[PDB]
Amino acid sequence: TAITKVEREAVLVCELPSFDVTDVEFDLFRARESTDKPLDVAAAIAYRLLLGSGLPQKFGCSDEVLLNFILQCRKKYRNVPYHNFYHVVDVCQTIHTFLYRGNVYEKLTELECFVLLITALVHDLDHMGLNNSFYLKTESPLGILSSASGNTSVLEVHHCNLAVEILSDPESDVFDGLEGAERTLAFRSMIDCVLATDMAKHGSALEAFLASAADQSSDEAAFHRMTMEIILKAGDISNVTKPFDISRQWAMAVTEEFYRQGDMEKERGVEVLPMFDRSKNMELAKGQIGFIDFVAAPFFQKIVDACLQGMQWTVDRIKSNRAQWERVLETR
């Protein structure tokens, strides 16, 4: 279904007036509420980041093809509290700051940077606010399909499929200007990055990245790839690296998705983890502190110590968000 000229022009008119999209403290929530067309603003942020980078022009992607691509991604995100178009635009923006303020561009080629920024926008296509466990535990059609076809990353495979479908049309194929090994690397690296977002693979992905970083004779291609996976992973859990108020808003939104899954799980007669249980009302702060201590702090501290020195601010910001959550608890 082609993109109208009207859909494009609506995005193209957006000014972005009091906003620096390149900055680590960019506030997507304030961008949304400053317009009655927040979905067009979101699209314009992605469009301007991408064009502003110089990367699409280097790889033969025209302005029009880029914008069509962004709009075809947008059509496939749903009206869910968290895993929506704003999330992926946020991940794109955040990865941009990791590459260009955190200087991770030093570890990757320009092609890999372009692929990562594009991959951010496809990485949760058609998410329905339900995680992989829901599908496997309820024996839903997608769960059965995954089980029968091998791979337990139900959603990530689904997202890759839709990404491939979008890119198979030349009018939205941001990789159309590539050929041969470069076009293959684009698709293979996109898919690997998206598959690496499944949190069941978190420890394995991290170990593999760290082992590959410690090894000076690492297969360069595989180290580059690992770096891409880790950067998409970092963007995906980057809410805790943001100014506290921004971090808190994302945490409220994800929590609402967890509760809606738990409602759906209860009414299907399946097991509900207490974090998903609306009626066993839980403290936002303990959940954030839990995530920080067991997942995010070691992840970001390790990748920074191992090789990504320029992303030091992420560790500092996690440390200060954690302390703030700890004071929310201490004063209750």
Q: Closest CB to Zn ion among 40 and 124? A: 124
Q: CA 75, CA 169: separation in Å to the nearest integer?
A: 15
Burial letters for 184-200: b for 16+ Cβ neighbours within 10 Å, e otherwise?
ebbbebbbbbbbbbbee
Q: How far is the CB of 57 from Zn ion (least distance, A)?
A: 27
Q: How far is the CB of 87 from Zn ion (least distance, A)?
A: 6
Contact region for Mg ion (CB under 5 A) — 146-154, 192-200, 244-252, 269-277? 192-200
Q: Closest CB to Zn ion among 112 and 124? A: 124
Locus of tokens 């110590």: 305
The answer to whether 103 is a known ligand-binding residue is no
What's the Cα-to-Cα distance from 324 to each of 157, 285, 328, 331, rounded to whole Å?
A: 37, 9, 6, 11
**Within 10 A of 75 (CB to CB), how many other CB atoms are there?**
13
Q: Closest CB to Zn ion among 41 and 125? A: 125
Q: CA 305, CA 322: separation in Å to the nearest integer?
A: 20
Q: Closest CB to Zn ion among 236 and 265? A: 236
Q: CA 19, CA 266: separation in Å to the nearest integer?
A: 43
The answer to whether 93 is a known ligand-binding residue is no
| Helix or strand run (H / E) with residue 286 | helix 284-291
Find which of Zn ion, Mg ion, none residue 265 binds, CB within 5 to 8 Å per kind: none
The answer to whether 281 is a known ligand-binding residue is no
Give the x/- contact pattern for Mg ion in 95-134, rule: CB under 5 A: -----------------------------x----------
Binding residue ranges for AMP: 83-87, 124, 236, 288
Residues binding Mg ion (CB under 5 A): 124, 197
Residues annotated as catalytic (active site), given as ranges: 83
